[PDB]
Amino acid sequence: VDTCSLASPASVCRTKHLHLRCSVDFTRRTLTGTAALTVQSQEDNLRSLVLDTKDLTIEKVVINGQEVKYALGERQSYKGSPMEISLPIALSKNQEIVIEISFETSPKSSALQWLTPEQTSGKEHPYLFSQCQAIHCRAILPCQDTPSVKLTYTAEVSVPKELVALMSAIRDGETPDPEDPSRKIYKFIQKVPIPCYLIALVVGALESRQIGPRTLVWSEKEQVEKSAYEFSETESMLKIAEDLGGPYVWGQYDLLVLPPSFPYGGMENPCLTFVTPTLLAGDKSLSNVIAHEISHSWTGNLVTNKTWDHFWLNEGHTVYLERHICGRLFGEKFRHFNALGGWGELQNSVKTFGETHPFTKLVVDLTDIDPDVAYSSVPYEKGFALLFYLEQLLGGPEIFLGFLKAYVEKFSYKSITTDDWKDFLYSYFKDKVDVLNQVDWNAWLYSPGLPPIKPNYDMTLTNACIALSQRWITAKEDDLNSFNATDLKDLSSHQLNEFLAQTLQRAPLPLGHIKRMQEVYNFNAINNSEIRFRWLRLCIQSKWEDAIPLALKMATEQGRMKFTRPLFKDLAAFDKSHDQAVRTYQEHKASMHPVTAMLVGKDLKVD
Ligand SMILES: O=C(O)c1ccc(CN2C[C@@H]3C[C@H]2CN3Cc2ccc(Oc3ccc(-c4ncco4)cc3)cc2)cc1
Ligand SMILES: [Yb+3]
Ligand SMILES: [Yb+3]
Numbered sequence: 001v002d003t004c005s006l007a008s009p010a011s012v013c014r015t016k017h018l019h020l021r022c023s024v025d026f027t028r029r030t031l032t033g034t035a036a037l038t039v040q041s042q043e044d045n046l047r048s049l050v051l052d053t054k055d056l057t058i059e060k061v062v063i064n065g066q067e068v069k070y071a072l073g074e075r076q077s078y079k080g081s082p083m084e085i086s087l088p089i090a091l092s093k094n095q096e097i098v099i100e101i102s103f104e105t106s107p108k109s110s111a112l113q114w115l116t117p118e119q120t121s122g123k124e125h126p127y128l129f130s131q132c133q134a135i136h137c138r139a140i141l142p143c144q145d146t147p148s149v150k151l152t153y154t155a156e157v158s159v160p161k162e163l164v165a166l167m168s169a170i171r172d173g174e175t176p177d178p179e180d181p182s183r184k185i186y187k188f189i190q191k192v193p194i195p196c197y198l199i200a201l202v203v204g205a206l207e208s209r210q211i212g213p214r215t216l217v218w219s220e221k222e223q224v225e226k227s228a229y230e231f232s233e234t235e236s237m238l239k240i241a242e243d244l245g246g247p248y249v250w251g252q253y254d255l256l257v258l259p260p261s262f263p264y265g266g267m268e269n270p271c272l273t274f275v276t277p278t279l280l281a282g283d284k285s286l287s288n289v290i291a292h293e294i295s296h297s298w299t300g301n302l303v304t305n306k307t308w309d310h311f312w313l314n315e316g317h318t319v320y321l322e323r324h325i326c327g328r329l330f331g332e333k334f335r336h337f338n339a340l341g342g343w344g345e346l347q348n349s350v351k352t353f354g355e356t357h358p359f360t361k362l363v364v365d366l367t368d369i370d371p372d373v374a375y376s377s378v379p380y381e382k383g384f385a386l387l388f389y390l391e392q393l394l395g396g397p398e399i400f401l402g403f404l405k406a407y408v409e410k411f412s413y414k415s416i417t418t419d420d421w422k423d424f425l426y427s428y429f430k431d432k433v434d435v436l437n438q439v440d441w442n443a444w445l446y447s448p449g450l451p452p453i454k455p456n457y458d459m460t461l462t463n464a465c466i467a468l469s470q471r472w473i474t475a476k477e478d479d480l481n482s483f484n485a486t487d488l489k490d491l492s493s494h495q496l497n498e499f500l501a502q503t504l505q506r507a508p509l510p511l512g513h514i515k516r517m518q519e520v521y522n523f524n525a526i527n528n529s530e531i532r533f534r535w536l537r538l539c540i541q542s543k544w545e546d547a548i549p550l551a552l553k554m555a556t557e558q559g560r561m562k563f564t565r566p567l568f569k570d571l572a573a574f575d576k577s578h579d580q581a582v583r584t585y586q587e588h589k590a591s592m593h594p595v596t597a598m599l600v601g602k603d604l605k606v607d
């Protein structure tokens, strides 16, 4: 039972394939077309079925060439409206039928962001992108919007001829639209069964550059050169991921660099990973996000969470694989550095929510909870901490990686729960069950707050970060003159970021210390988004008014939620910038991504 879906469950019927034929209308801000669902009955005498929809206009439903009866139920807030379809003939078990639904999206679809030419790099063409995870696919097309169902898909997308369409699938050609010569049709094929949250579409003035044997980078022309360099390690990361998880089954691994309002660091859309342009640091330092998206090609896209309550399965194992890829490229001391940094991010999330908050549990109950509201570092970091703890308990990384590959092999093309994972862990490590029974499973999986045990971490690379952060925190006015630009000479960008994260955990610091830090280190000149974000939070929480325009500019010139949400919250919490934060949100709201707009509104208590 998936409590986030209003559709018939997988025990009643299952969508085997989607054939999508649609047209993108930038003047109306609508996607119009037909979603033809091949559905297999799982029951005898099946006469109706229910699909998820959200702000969709339904024109008609056709089965066997004839229009059928359908009804839309009352809207259930963020879940949308259930659509019940009356089948013309009762189905026996395993019988399949094709249901062609003619629909139109709303301009306010929570899955989409429609951009004006002014909101793009080129300024001459509009742009469109989707983001279906977790339950936004129902805001694009009628479907069983649950990761417990996997389907293949084909698509034909009509767009203005000057633009390019891409999807989370293999490109299958382009032609002039026969029905309209001012338009082009782009075709797509996804032969690997996927959960519908993995369906994705982008339409814009896109260009491509090859960066590897199975990888193109796509973006507007202005970003192509910088993106090709930034993500040049992609093929090397794919090779390591294949060694760790088994064959890469998806064919292509392309990257799309979105406009700055893209709400996440990345999204693992199969064949076409979507990434934020905030990764463009100029030195490949934020490449762990690519390693993370690559890892999802096994943990999440092949082995999928059965419901959103088990999302930690997707995230925890992916962070685990991501840290092994970066460890293979940069060394074991680096894997430990990132792992320890992750524990710190977990401390921050637990502190923010509170140690008894149900969103700090590894397995959550999302029945009447919007998954976008529950989203945090918890399933990533508490999930990673559990696996890292298990690796240490069970004999080390080589042994635990054997389990990871067997786990991916066992559950490929399936959707699983925490109980399925735990059962297989016990089966694989049957000769180590005495060790496994020492784990406080109830606390790890079902209890809020920090985990009951903290793993062992090598401190080699972290030591210099802690030492410099402690020098600043313990410094008095008479010690400020001792700081100098030479303090940073032996720190990598990763270490500078960690120094800032350690210091931010003890914020606020006195205003004089923050002014001195700018005087000696010139942090205002750093473009790296992670470093700049932590530095600006530190300035605002330490009440430096000079940082107000910089923080406001960062919060609005990009829309990655990891940065935008805490920046607006810190600005609303500083009396000097409170009104500015609220007014800036109000002025930008109508041109923001719909999910980001909703969440920033909730954070600021602005309805
Ligand atoms: O750095 C970054 O900015 C960054 C950000 C994002 C990404 C990738 N994403 C794509 C997008 C966000 C994440 C997953 N997608 C959305 C989503 C998925 C599931 C969900 O439902 C939940 C279920 C359980 C729990 C839960 N809470 C505690 C335990 O379990 C929490 C949410 C809600 C939203 C990569 C990088
Ligand atoms: Yb083909
Ligand atoms: Yb002193």
Ligand SMILES: [Zn+2]
Pocket (backbone or CB within 6 Å): 292, 296, 314, 315, 318
């Ligand atoms: Zn992820």
